[PDB]
């Protein structure tokens, strides 16, 4: 009867505890009692938030160490629902959950996994890099990367769907931010644990919706070559289609591109969607998030503020509802 729901790409190979890395990986459970504690090992500066009976609690970190943290306490004695959310992205380190403790209380039967499922594929925007920063000149701060208030997570909660957030700040299709060497998105996409080489079994999570927001890094400094960019994008779509033949795929642009980088990326992604559509695959769509204009502020290094994430989520929720007929 009692058990735990692991929402995300988790590796269960170590009997000492499940491991994960991607943004928004989360552990969901019911417990009886008045408090709950967890022991977490984290490879780098990871931040977490507990949401208990629908109340988000102050976030906390576990930084390149193993810590036992009392997540919540002083509750009325009874049954309670807990989501434990990894705020921070994969590059800030893998996380292993080494056990929960309920004091005098006990673990209850887990909620069932949600039937509606979304996979997001993206960069800093999807990671919600800097969304709790307060001005665009501020540099990255692990504590301010709140993926629970990413446009992705908000949209998933709007739709009562689970989401896997396969995203990595600075990553592109043809190049990484500023030409930085290293794996590109297709290189990292096949992994559960991108630093320790554990590959994901795609049959384990088949989403009805895939949301792709890539290309900001391909156009934010140097402009990627059109053929190279279009070919990389079609290759990603092919891989998604290989694992999820029936998914509805939303190809997104915005809201951080501007000027000619925005014009080119928009044009190229539109062309990719148009090409798929003329090829008979009618379940590939284009979405544009209007460029941010300062009126909802900026997060660190120009990345979207929570307010901008909420606008994006409003728009993406409507697009998904339209195409899937959800709600
Ligand atoms: O987790 C850590 C992670 O970091 C990754 O690298 C980060 C990198 O460290 C950051 O410096 C970088 O920051 C840049 C943004 O990516 C980029 O989008 C942004 O572009 C700005 C630009 O600087 C600014 O001039 C531009 O202004 C235009 C306005 O937007 C228009 O409204 C107006 O009309 O015209 C002006 C142009 O005149 O705006 C854009 C945004 O729209 O510049 C940031 C640097 O200042 O981000 C990277 C991640 O996204 C690293 O790669 C990872 O490896 C590492 O782990």
Author numbering: 8 to 334
What does the primary publication say about this deposited structure?
CE2 enzymes are acetyl esterases (that are generally not appended to other catalytic modules), which are reported to be active on synthetic aryl-esters and acetylated xylan. All three 3D structures reveal a bi-domain enzyme in which an N-terminal β-sheet “jelly roll” domain (around 130 residues) is linked to a C-terminal domain of approximately 220 residues. The C-terminal domains possess an atypical α/β-hydrolase (SGNH-hydrolase) fold, consisting of repeating β-α-β motifs that form a curved central five-stranded parallel β-sheet, in the strand order β2, β1, β3, β4, and β5 with strand β2 interrupted by loop insertion.
Mutation of His-791 to alanine reduces affinity for cellohexaose ∼20-fold but, intriguingly, the S612A mutant binds to the oligosaccharide ∼8-fold more tightly than the native protein. In one conformation the hydroxyl makes a polar contact with cellohexaose forcing the ligand away from the histidine. In the S612A mutant the hexasaccharide adopts a different conformation in which it is now able to make a, presumably more productive, hydrogen bond with the histidine.
